[PDB]
Structure formats: C-alpha cells, structure tokens
Amino acid sequence: QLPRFVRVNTLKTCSDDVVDYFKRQGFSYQGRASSLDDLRALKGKHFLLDPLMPELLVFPAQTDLHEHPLYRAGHLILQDRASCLPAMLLDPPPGSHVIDACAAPGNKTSHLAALLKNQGKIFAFDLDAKRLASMATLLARAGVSCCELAEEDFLAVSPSDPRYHEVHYILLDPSCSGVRLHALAGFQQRALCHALTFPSLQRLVYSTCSLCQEENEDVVRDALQQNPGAFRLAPALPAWPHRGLSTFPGAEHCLRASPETTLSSGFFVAVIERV
Ligand SMILES: C[S@@+](CC[C@H](N)C(=O)[O-])C[C@H]1O[C@@H](n2cnc3c(N)ncnc32)[C@H](O)[C@@H]1O
Numbered sequence: 001q002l003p004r005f006v007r008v009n010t011l012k013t014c015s016d017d018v019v020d021y022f023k024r025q026g027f028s029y030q031g032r033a034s035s036l037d038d039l040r041a042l043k044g045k046h047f048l049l050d051p052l053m054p055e056l057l058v059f060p061a062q063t064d065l066h067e068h069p070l071y072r073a074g075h076l077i078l079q080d081r082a083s084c085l086p087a088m089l090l091d092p093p094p095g096s097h098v099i100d101a102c103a104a105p106g107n108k109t110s111h112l113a114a115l116l117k118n119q120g121k122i123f124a125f126d127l128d129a130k131r132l133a134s135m136a137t138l139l140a141r142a143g144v145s146c147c148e149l150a151e152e153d154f155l156a157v158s159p160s161d162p163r164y165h166e167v168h169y170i171l172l173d174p175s176c177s178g179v180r181l182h183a184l185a186g187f188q189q190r191a192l193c194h195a196l197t198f199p200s201l202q203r204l205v206y207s208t209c210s211l212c213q214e215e216n217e218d219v220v221r222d223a224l225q226q227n228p229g230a231f232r233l234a235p236a237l238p239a240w241p242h243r244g245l246s247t248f249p250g251a252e253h254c255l256r257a258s259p260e261t262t263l264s265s266g267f268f269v270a271v272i273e274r275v
Contacts, residue, residue, distance in 0.1 A: 002263055003039050004059040005050070005081045010114045011143045013075040015055060021070060022047060033058065036263055052239055053084050055114075074141040079107050082257040082267035086205040087111035089236055089271050092169040094119040099164065100147075101154045101172045101195060104131035106138045108171055113144040122147045123164060125154045154191055159198045168202040170195045176208035176215050185214045192223040196231060196272070203234070207269040216268040217247045217254065224272075234271040244270070 008015045019029050030048040033039050038048065042060045050056035056079075059065070070076045087108050092098045094117045100109045103124035112122050124147055126132050132151055139147055157164070172195050174188050188208070195204055206223075208215050224231060233253040242261045244254025257267035 001061045002081075002259060003042050003061055004063050004065070005079060005084070005264075006057045006059065006065060007077045007079045007084060007111065008055040008057060009075055009077050009110070009142050010055060011118060012073065013070075015049070015057070018057065018070060018075060039263055050081065052237070053081065053088065056081065056084055072141075074143055077107065077110055077138075077142060079111070080265045080267075082209075082255075082262060082264035082269075083107055084111065085237070085240075085255060085257075085267070085269050086171055086173060086207045087115055089269060090115075090169050090171055090203060090205045092116060092120070092203075096120045096169055097164070097167045098122045098169040098171065099157075099167050099195070099198070100124040101157075101170060101191060102126060102174045103149070104128055104135040106135035108173055109135065109147055110138055110142045110144055112171060113139075113142070113146055116146055118144065118146045120146055123157075123167065124149045125152045125157060127151065127153060155194055157194075159194075164198060166200060167198055168200055170198060170201060170204040171207075172204060173207045176210040177212050181212065181214060185212075185219060188215055188219045189222055192219055193226050196223060196226065202274050204231075204272045205269060206272065207267065209265050209267050211256075211258070211266045211268075213245055213247060216256075216270075217245050217251050220244075220254065220270045220272070221248045221251070229275060231272050232275050234273045236269065236271045244268070 008018050027045040032049040033051040047059045103109050104126035109124050233250040235253045242256045244251040254270040257264045
C-alpha cells in the first residue's frame with residue numbers, strides 16, 4: 001500500500017530532533033527524497049523527507065507509529081501526503097486570523113496552528129460531536145493554543161460578525177463523495193460561496209478527497225461565477241504535476257492527487273485569491 005506519512009509538529013519539536021530520535025532506534029535516515037520513486041522504494045527501517053512537502057517524513061508502508069513515544073508527545077502527526085497541501089498553500093502568517101470552516105477531526109487545523117506558530121486565531125467549526133472530541137484530543141496533544149473551536153453550522157456563521165472582521169484566510173475542506181453526490185456538491189457550493197463573502201478575505205483554499213469533477217472543478221467554477229472579477233485562481237505548487245482537469249480557463253491552477261500519481265489519497269485543492 002502507500003508509504004506512511006508523518007508530519008513533524010513544529011509547535012513541539014523540529015525535524016532534526018525527530019530524525020535523531022529515530023536514528024537512535026536504529027532507523028536509517030536517507031535525507032530528502034529526489035523523487036516519488038524514492039518513496040516507492042522505501043523499505044526496512046529507512047526513512048526520508050518528502051521530496052516537496054516541508055516537515056513531512058515518510059516511512060515504509062508497514063510501520064505503525066500510533067503507539068510511538070513521539071506520537072504520544074505530539075511530536076508526530078499522522079497525516080496523508082495530500083492532506084498537507086491545503087494549510088501549506090494557504091500559508092497564513094503568524095498573527096493572522098483564519099477560519100477552518102469544516103474542521104474536525106483537526107488535522108489541517110493543527111497544521112495551520114503550526115504555520116501560525118500559535119500566534120493569531122483559528123476559528124474552527126464542525127457539526128459532528130464525535131469528530132470534535134477527537135479534534136480536542138489532537139489539538140491538545142499537538143500543543144495548539146490558538147484555536148477557538150465551535151460546534152456550529154458554517155453556513156450559520158455570519159460574515160458580518162465582529163469576531164471575524166480580521167479573518168484574511170479560510171480553509172474549506174467539506175465532506176465529500178464516497179454517490180451521496182448531488183447533495184454533497186450542493187453543500188460544497190453553498191459553503192464556498194458563503195466563505196467568499198467574508199469581508200476581509202484575501203486567500204481561501206478549497207479541498208476535497210474526491211476524484212469527481214462535480215465536487216471539485218465544477219464547484220470552483222460555479223463559485224467564481226458568483227461575483228465575477230472578485231476572485232481568481234492562484235497558480236498552485238508548479239512542481240506538483242497532477243493538476244485540475246482542464247474544464248474551464250485556469251482550472252489547471254488547481255491540484256489533483258491519487259495513489260498512483262502522487263502516492264496519496266484521491267484529493268483536489270484550489271487556491272483562490274482576492275483580486
Ligand atoms: C473532510 S471532513 C474535514 C477534515 C478536517 N478538515 C481535517 O483536516 O481533519 C468534513 C467535515 O465537515 C463537517 N461538516 C459537515 N457539514 C458542516 C457544516 N454545515 N458546518 C461545519 N461543518 C460541517 C463534517 O462533520 C466533517 O467533520
């Protein structure tokens with residue numbers, strides 16, 4: 001199956017320290033991968049850094065770290081390779097205000113917090129109590145202190161609420177396919193259009209783990225047609241070769257992902273910026 005991807009949580013440690021710990025357990029550090037073939041070749045107790053994703057270590061498919069001392073300590077966060085894209089691309093600076101619109105169980109929220117260096121605010125929302133409970137555990141384990149978490153419908157969050165007036169960055173990572181399809185795409189469109197109405201918004205990242213154009217390029221296309229000229233697609237990570245389907249002008253600025261092409265979950269990401 002796929003290699004195991006583990007994000008070094010910079011809130012609590014650094015890559016040098018994690019590497020040294022694993023070395024002392026008899027793992028052999030291979031540096032940074034030159035290519036995906038390097039990751040595909042991973043075996044035994046070799047490990048390396050992802051060829052593109054900062055702070056992302058990669059281990060052979062048959063290694064479990066859920067019980068590792070560094071997992072307990074919140075030094076490692078087990079996060080699919082493509083799941084690391086949205087916060088990295090959003091790139092909010094320390095001190096900024098961010099909304100994580102569909103946040104639980106908090107993997108991307110924890111990544112945002114690391115990028116913020118726990119400075120600023122992440123207003124996170126979700127409706128699922130069980131996933132919210134998992135999120136509380138993850139956030140605390142990872143040492144996140146900048147998140148205000150609410151059990152709320154994102155569509156009920158008012159863009160004119162004074163609490164969100166300095167929000168410049170939004171991460172929108174809504175539920176997606178699995179043939180529940182038209183309803184899912186409906187929520188995705190509603191949520192994206194809603195997010196784009198936030199008064200001070202500068203950059204938004206939209207992501208799914210779907211392969212379906214209806215949930216991906218079509219949603220972005222339709223949202224951009226809401227207020228033509230207000231927002232544009234930004235040209236995301238050129239070194240990532242799997243792009244959005246060429247279904248509208250600029251769509252190739254989005255990213256796609258799959259086990260076979262990118263050693264990750266099926267995934268889609270669009271970087272949307274204010275004009
Ligand atoms: C793909 S998961 C998000 C994963 C999360 N971003 C992470 O990185 O771990 C989608 C989430 O959307 C939540 N959700 C569904 N409808 C919502 C709504 N109306 N408002 C806020 N969250 C919602 C679901 O409960 C689910 O937790």
